[PDB]
Amino acid sequence: LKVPPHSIEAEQSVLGGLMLDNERWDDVAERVVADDFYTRPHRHIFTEMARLQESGSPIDLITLAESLERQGQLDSVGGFAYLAELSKNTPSAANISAYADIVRERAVVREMISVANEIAEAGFDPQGRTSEDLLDLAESRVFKIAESRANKDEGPKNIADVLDATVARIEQLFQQPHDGVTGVNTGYDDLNKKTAGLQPSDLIIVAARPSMGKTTFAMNLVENAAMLQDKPVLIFSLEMPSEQIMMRSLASLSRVDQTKIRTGQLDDEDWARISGTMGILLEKRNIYIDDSSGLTPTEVRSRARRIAREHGGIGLIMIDYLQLMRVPALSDNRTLEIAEISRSLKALAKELNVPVVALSQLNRSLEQRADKRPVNSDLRESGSIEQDADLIMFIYRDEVYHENSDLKGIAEIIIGKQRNGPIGTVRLTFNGQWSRFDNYAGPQY
Amino acid sequence: LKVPPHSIEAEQSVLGGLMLDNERWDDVAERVVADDFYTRPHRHIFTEMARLQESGSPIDLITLAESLERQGQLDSVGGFAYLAELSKNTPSAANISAYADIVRERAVVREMISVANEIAEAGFDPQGRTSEDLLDLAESRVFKIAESRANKDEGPKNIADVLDATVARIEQLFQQPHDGVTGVNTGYDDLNKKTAGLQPSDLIIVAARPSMGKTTFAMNLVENAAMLQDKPVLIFSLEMPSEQIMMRSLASLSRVDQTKIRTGQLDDEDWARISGTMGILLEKRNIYIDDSSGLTPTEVRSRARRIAREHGGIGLIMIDYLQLMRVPALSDNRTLEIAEISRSLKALAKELNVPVVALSQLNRSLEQRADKRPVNSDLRESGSIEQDADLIMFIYRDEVYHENSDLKGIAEIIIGKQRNGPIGTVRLTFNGQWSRFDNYAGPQY
Amino acid sequence: LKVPPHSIEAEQSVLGGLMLDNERWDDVAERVVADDFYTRPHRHIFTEMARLQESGSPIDLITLAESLERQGQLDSVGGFAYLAELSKNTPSAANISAYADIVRERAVVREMISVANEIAEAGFDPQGRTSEDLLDLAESRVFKIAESRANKDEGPKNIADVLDATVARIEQLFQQPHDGVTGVNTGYDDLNKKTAGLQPSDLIIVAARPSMGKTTFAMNLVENAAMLQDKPVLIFSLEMPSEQIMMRSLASLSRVDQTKIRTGQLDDEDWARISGTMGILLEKRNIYIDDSSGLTPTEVRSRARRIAREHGGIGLIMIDYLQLMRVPALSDNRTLEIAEISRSLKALAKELNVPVVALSQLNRSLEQRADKRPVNSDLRESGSIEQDADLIMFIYRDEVYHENSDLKGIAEIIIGKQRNGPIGTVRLTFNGQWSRFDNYAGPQY
Amino acid sequence: QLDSVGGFAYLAELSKNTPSAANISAYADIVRERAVVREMISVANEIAEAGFDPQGRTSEDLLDLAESRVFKIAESRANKDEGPKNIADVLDAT
Numbered sequence A, B, C: 001l002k003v004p005p006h007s008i009e010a011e012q013s014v015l016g017g018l019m020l021d022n023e024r025w026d027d028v029a030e031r032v033v034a035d036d037f038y039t040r041p042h043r044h045i046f047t048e049m050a051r052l053q054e055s056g057s058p059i060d061l062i063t064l065a066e067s068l069e070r071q072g073q074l075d076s077v078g079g080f081a082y083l084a085e086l087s088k089n090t091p092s093a094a095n096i097s098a099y100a101d102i103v104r105e106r107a108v109v110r111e112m113i114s115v116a117n118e119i120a121e122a123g124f125d126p127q128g129r130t131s132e133d134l135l136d137l138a139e140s141r142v143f144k145i146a147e148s149r150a151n152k153d154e155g156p157k158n159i160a161d162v163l164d165a166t167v168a169r170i171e172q173l174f175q176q177p178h179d180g181v182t183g184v185n186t187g188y189d190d191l192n193k194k195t196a197g198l199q200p201s202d203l204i205i206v207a208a209r210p211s212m213g214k215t216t217f218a219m220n221l222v223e224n225a226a227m228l229q230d231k232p233v234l235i236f237s238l239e240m241p242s243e244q245i246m247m248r249s250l251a252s253l254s255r256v257d258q259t260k261i262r263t264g265q266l267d268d269e270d271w272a273r274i275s276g277t278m279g280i281l282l283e284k285r286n287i288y289i290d291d292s293s294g295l296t297p298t299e300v301r302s303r304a305r306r307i308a309r310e311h312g313g314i315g316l317i318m319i320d321y322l323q324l325m326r327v328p329a330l331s332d333n334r335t336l337e338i339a340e341i342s343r344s345l346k347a348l349a350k351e352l353n354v355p356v357v358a359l360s361q362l363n364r365s366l367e368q369r370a371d372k373r374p375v376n377s378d379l380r381e382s383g384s385i386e387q388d389a390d391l392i393m394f395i396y397r398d399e400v401y402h403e404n405s406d407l408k409g410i411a412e413i414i415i416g417k418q419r420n421g422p423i424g425t426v427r428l429t430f431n432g433q434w435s436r437f438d439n440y441a442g443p444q445y
Numbered sequence D: 001q002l003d004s005v006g007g008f009a010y011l012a013e014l015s016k017n018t019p020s021a022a023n024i025s026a027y028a029d030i031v032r033e034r035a036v037v038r039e040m041i042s043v044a045n046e047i048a049e050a051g052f053d054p055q056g057r058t059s060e061d062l063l064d065l066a067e068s069r070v071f072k073i074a075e076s077r078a079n080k081d082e083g084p085k086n087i088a089d090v091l092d093a094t
C-alpha cells in the first residue's frame, strides 16, 4: 500500500532498448539521468553506458562487460549472467522515449517524497531554530525543486532562445528565394499582396450578410488551393450538404451555370469542361468534405487530426457558419459558447499548423447606418472572433443595396482586420451564375 | 526523541494570565487562535473565553465554567476542579507577549510537518496525477501558508512611524538628483510628463480595440525599458507566440518592415540595422518571454518570482490580453474571474516592487456612440480593472474608422485614469509597417 | 455526567464579595433572589443580609452573624467558623455582577429541571385528566414562568423612558449653546448645512467612479477633523499604502503639488509649509493608518477597539473601498457578503458611537444614461449599503465626461441619501494637483 | 413480512376477539388521549435531559426553547374544534 513509487520493469526495458540500438541515446539522454534511476545496478549500467557513448559508440552486450571489467566490477553490479536477461527482454520498437519520460517523472516524485521527509525532519528537529529560519529554508528548497526540474521548453525563455527560432524561420524562408507568398496562395493576385497568402497558423474569418457570397468565396479559395497545393484540404459544410457544394464547385471550376448542371441542358463545350475538371479533381484527391450538422470543436479536432496523420498533413480547413458549432456545456450562455469555439479553432490551427477559415455572419446593425460597409464590430456574436482572429475580410457587393450602382458585377473584399499586415479594400468581379469570384484588371485602390 | 514540539507550560501560563486579567486579551488574541492549540479541552475553553470577551468581558474563574455549563458541556473538556486548577496556577508576571509568541510560533510548524506528510503520502497515492500537477499542489500549499503567515507586521501605525518611511522615501529620491522621471522610462518624452514614468508598485493598463496598437505599444515600452535599464523584464504572451513577437520587435527597433523580414527582401542598409539591434539585445540579456496559453495568476507569480532572484530583480512585466487568464475555481462567474485576476496582478506588483502592464480589450459600446474615443468604462469585463489599476491609457487611431481624415499616421494615448497624477490625451505617430509608435514633434494638444 | 445542575463556587464567591463590600449591593440585588440559591443556609444568609441592607447598612462579618443570632439560628446554617471560611476566601475583583447574573440564570435552569419533572409527574400520573385540561395547563405553566422575566431592559419599553433619554440628549445639546453643527466638523462650511456635521453613530458612504475624487474627499474629511478635534481618527487604506496617503495629505494641507514633493524639486516656500504641517501633525499625535488588505469586519472591530481603549476614545473611522473587505464564510454569495459587511460597520458605529466613513463604488449603469449624475441604485453591489446607511454623498465633477464644460474646477457633492436631514447638491472646487477639495464662493445653485 | 409483526395466527386471534359493536370511537378517544399523555412524558423527558446535557449555547435560547416547544405543541394539538361546517352555521357568524 505504501512504498516509494517506482517502475523498474520499463526501466530495464529502456536499458535493453538502448543496448539493441546505439543510435537513440541522445534523445533519452535529454531526459534520463544516471541518478534518475531507483536501484544502483541500473545506475552503474547507465552511467557506464554514458561514459562509453562519450568515447565508445558500440555498446550492446560485450563492450559493456569489458568496460565494466577493466576496473574490476563484475559480480558487484549484478552479473553478466544477470545482464543477459536485460538484453534478452525488450526487443520492442521505437516506443522508448515514452518509458524514458515516465520513469524520469517517477524520479521527480521520489525526490519530492525525499524532500518532504527532510522538511518533516527539520520540523520535529528544532536545533534551536525559529519559524523564520525554517519556513524560509522550506521555501528555498521547494523553490530550487520547482525552478529546476530539467524543464526548458515550457518556461519563460531568455532572448537568445527566441532569436534562434526567429533566425531559423528567416533561414527557412531565405534558403528558398521565391515569390512574395509565405504560405497558402488563393489564386487572387490582388489579395495575396495584402495577405502574403493565407498564413499557416491563423484563424481567418470570411464574413458577410447572407446573400453576399462568403460560402462561394471560401469554396473558391479552397478549390484554387487544391488546384495549386499538393496537400489536403477540408470543408465542413454545416449548413448545406455536399451535393450542393460540389455542384457549385464544378460550376466554378468550369464556368458553366448551375441550372445547366442540375437540370441538364448543357452543350458539348460545357460537357467537355466538366469532364476535364472532374478528371483533374479525381487525380489530386485533396478535397475532403464533411456535411455534419451540429458539430463540436472536439469533433472538428478529431476529424482533422485523422486526416492530418494518415493522408500526410494538411493545408487548410474551412468551416461554414461557425455559429452552428456547439459545445453543450456552455449551451445556455451563447456568448461564451462562441468564445470557446473560436479559442478552440485558434488552438487547432496552432496545433496542426494550418489556417482555419471560419465563415461567420453579421448583425442587423449596418442596415440602419447608410454606408453598409461592414465594420469589424458587425460580427454575429461575442466580439471575441475579432480578437482571436489574425485576419478578417468582409465582403460587400453594392449592387444588392443600390440597384442604381456603378459598381455592379463587383465585389470588394474589405480587409477589416489583420494583425501581421495591412488593411485595405481588394476588389473582384462577381459572377454568381457559375458561383465564382474572379480578378479585376481595372482601376487601383 | 522525535516528537511534535508543543511548549505546553507556557500554554497554561497564558490561560491563567487571561483568567487573572480580562484586560490583556485582544493583545494576546493578535496571535492566539483556536486551531493553534494542542489539546481539545484547551480549545473549547479558549473559544468560549473568546466568545465571552466578544460578548461578556468579565471572566476569571467561573464565568467560563458557567458559559460551558449554560448548555451541558461539563466533563468533556476535563473537569470542574480541573478548570479551577488552571486558575490556581501561574501567578507569573507580565511576560505574556513572549509566551503567546512561542505558543503561536509552534503551531504553524506543526501544520508545516502535517502538510509535508500530506504531500509525501499523496505522492505515494497519485490518484490519476502527474508530477506537473503535483509540484503545483506543493507550491500552492506552501505559499498559501507563507502568505497567510508572512503578514505579521500588521497594525494601525501611529503617524510618526508613517512619516518616518515617507520622508525616508522622499530623501532617497532627493538623495539622487535626476530628471523628472521617478520610475521606468517609457522612451516617449511626451508621456513621461503626465506620468513620471511607469511607477514601481502599480498596475498599468493599455487597452484598445483589436487593431489599434496595444500589443505593439506595450512591446515598445519593454523594448525601450530594456535598453534604458540594466534590469530584466518579462513578457507573457497569452495570445500569440514569441516567433512573431520578436519578428515584430526587430522591426520596431531597426525600422525595417515586417514583410521585408519574413520574405527576406531586406537590403544591406537594413541587414546592418538588424545586426546592430541583434548585437545589442544579446549583449544585455534582459528580456524573458513566455508563450504560454492559459496561464493562471499563480503560474504568473511563480514564473515571475523565478526570474526575480536568479537575475537580480525584475523591472517590468507585460501581460498580453489579460482576459485569457484563467482561474478554474471561478470558471462559471467570468466577472469574479476577472476580479481575481486583477487583484492578483496588483498584489504581485506590490510584492516585487515593479510595474505590471496588463493589456485588455474594450466592449462594443463605443461603436454605437459616434465619438469612438474610449472611456474608462469600456473595459472588457467586470469593471474592476478600472478600479484596481493606477494608470489606464487607451489608444485611438482615427484613421482606422474614418476613411477620410487628417489624423493619419497619428495615434493618441487617451489617459483615462491616474491615482497619483494627471489625466490627459497624448499624441504620437504610428507606422505599422515597422510596428512602432514614435514621438510627435508637432502641433499642440 | 448527569446530575441536577447547580453551581456553588460562584455562590460562596458572591456571598464573600458582599461580605467585603457594603458599597456595591443594589447591583447584585437587582439580579439574585433568596430562592435563587440551591442550599438553604446560604438562602438564610442572603435574605438576612438583604433585610439588613434595607434596615442595617453596615454588614461585613459581625453584623450579619449578630442578626442571625438575634433570630436564634447559629449552627443551623453551618456555623460562625464556617462563615469565617466564607469571609476569608473569595477576595475577587469587580467581576461580581457577572457571578450574580449567571447564578440568577442557574436558578432559572434548576427551575426548568423542576418544571419538566412536574410535567412528567402529571404525565405518569394522569389523575383521570382531559387533554384540554392537560396541554394548556402544562403550557400555561411555562408561560407563567416566562411571566417572571426580570430582564426588564427590552421590548416592553414604555414611552416615558424614551422621552427621558431624548430630553437628556436635548439637554446635552442645548446646555451647550453653539453653532448649528452637532457632530463632527468637516471644514466645508457649505456641507455642514445640509449635513449638520457627520453624526457620531451613522454610517457614511462616499461613492464615485474610479477617478472622481473619493479617497481624496475622505482624506480631507479625516485630516480636517484631525486638525479640529483633539480626538483620533483611523484610516483603513485597504487599497493603497500609507506612503502614498500621507504624501497626498501633506500636499493637501500644505498646498504644494505632489510632483514637486516626491521628485524633490520643491522650493523654500514649499519646504516651509511642509515643516509646518508636519510640526502640527506630530504635536497632536492623532492619526492612525492601517495598510492591511483583506480585512474582515472582526479585524476592523478589534483594531478600532484598541485605539478606542488606549488613546481615549475615537472620533472618526475611514474605510476605503469596502468591496475589499471579506468574510470568508460567504465567499460564494457576494451579495450576502456585502450585506454582512455593511451590517458590521453600522454595528460598529453604534457600538463606539463614532462615524464610519465607508467608501464604495458604482456600477456601469450611469454610462448608458447620458446624465451620469449618480443615484443610490448605482452602488456596486447588494443594495444594503443603500439601506443600512444614513448618509450617501456622491461626487460628480463634470469635466471628466464633457470636455467642453463650464464647470472645470467644480466638484459637486450630491447628497443622495440622508435620513436625518435633506438631500441636495453641494458644490466645491477640485484642485487635484495637491489633492484637495476646497469651498466655493459662487452663484446660486 | 409474515411473522415480522408477531404472526398471522396472532392476527386471527385479533379478528376472533372483541365482538363489540356499540363503541369504538370512545375507545379510540381514550387511546389517543393516553398517546397524548405519552408524548407529554416524551417532551418532559427531553426537557430534563436537555437541562442536564443539551450541549452548548447560552440559556437565553434555552428559555426560548422551552417556550417554543410549549407553544409549538400547543398549536400542533389545540385545534380539534376544527371541521367542515354548515352554511346555516357559517352564516350565523357572518
Ligand SMILES: [Mg+2]
Pocket: A214, A215, A239, A320, A321
Ligand atoms: Mg453559407
Ligand SMILES: [Mg+2]
Pocket: B214, B215, B239, B320, B321
Ligand atoms: Mg495583441
Ligand SMILES: [Mg+2]
Pocket: C214, C215, C239, C320
Ligand atoms: Mg481610492
